Amino acid sequence: KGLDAVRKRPGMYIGDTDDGTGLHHMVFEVVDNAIDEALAGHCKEIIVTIHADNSVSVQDDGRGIPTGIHPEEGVSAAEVIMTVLHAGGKFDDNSYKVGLHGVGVSVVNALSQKLELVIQREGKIHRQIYEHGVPQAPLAVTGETEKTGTMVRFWPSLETFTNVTEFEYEILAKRLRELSFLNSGVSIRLRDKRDGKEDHFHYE
Ligand SMILES: Cc1[nH]c(C(=O)Nc2nc3c(OCc4cccc(C(=O)O)c4)cc(C(=O)O)cc3s2)c(Cl)c1Cl
Numbered sequence: 107k108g109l110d111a112v113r114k115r116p117g118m119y120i121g122d123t124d125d126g127t128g129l130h131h132m133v134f135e136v137v138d139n140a141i142d143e144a145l146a147g148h149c150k151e152i153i154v155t156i157h158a159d160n161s162v163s164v165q166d167d168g169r170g171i172p173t174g175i176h177p178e179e180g181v182s183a184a185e186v187i188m189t190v191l192h193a194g195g196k197f198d199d200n201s202y203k204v205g206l207h208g209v210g211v212s213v214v215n216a217l218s219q220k221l222e223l224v225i226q227r228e229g230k231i232h233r234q235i236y237e238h239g240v241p242q243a244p245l246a247v248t249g250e251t252e253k254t255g256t257m258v259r260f261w262p263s264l265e266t267f268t269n270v271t272e273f274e275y276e277i278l279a280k281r282l283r284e285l286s287f288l289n290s291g292v293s294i295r296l297r298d299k300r301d302g303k304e305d306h307f308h309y310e
């Protein structure tokens with residue numbers, strides 16, 4: 107019900123879907139959840155990549171989204187946060203009234219024709235794929251790791267986002283400079299695989 111409401115009324119969640127506002131807000135919601143993981147004391151570096159196909163990935167080195175089975179939903183906690191709008195505690199399905207805290211990545215998932223989630227946690231890499239917010243398989247172990255963190259790569263839905271479908275480096279760079287200044291403990295990298303441009307923001 108939650109993701110359906112987002113697909114139907116994306117304007118209410120992410121902003122204008124025609125003038126590039128919503129499209130960049132998609133990146134901002136993912137980055138905000140990485141910044142929350144830095145605020146909480148776990149994440150020290152965030153890497154934002156504009157891929158050659160105008161998907162965007164956000165990598166953090168925090169705890170990794172929990173992978174254990176959710177006691178209520180009976181699927182991975184990661185799948186619950188990705189697919190149950192109310193679970194993150196930021197958004198709900200109200201079509202009348204539009205806040206500050208909680209995980210909002212389910213809105214990005216809903217409005218992405220594809221999303222890739224990779225979690226490094228408890229010595230294992232875990233991967234799940236979604237299309238239009240629908241998981242294509244359960245969260246699966248792909249390998250071993252000595253690191254922790256979360257990677258979200260999303261392909262904005264070309265059924266939702268019209269006219270402006272390509273990311274503007276400068277729009278993302280400005281928000282990451284602001285976030286780097288305010289979150290002086292975090293290193294933020296921006297990489298554009300379309301033209302090779304890269305930046306590193308870290309409070310000096
Ligand atoms: C790029 C990116 N990174 C992350 C991310 O690392 N997030 C994480 N959230 C948690 C977590 O809380 C999940 C939750 C659920 C409901 C409301 C909240 C809240 O903050 O209000 C929070 C718990 C634990 C634990 O117990 O080890 C670890 C993690 S890592 C996300 Cl998401 C996106 Cl996107």
Ligand SMILES: [Mg+2]
Nearest residue numbers: 198199200201
């Ligand atoms: Mg409701």
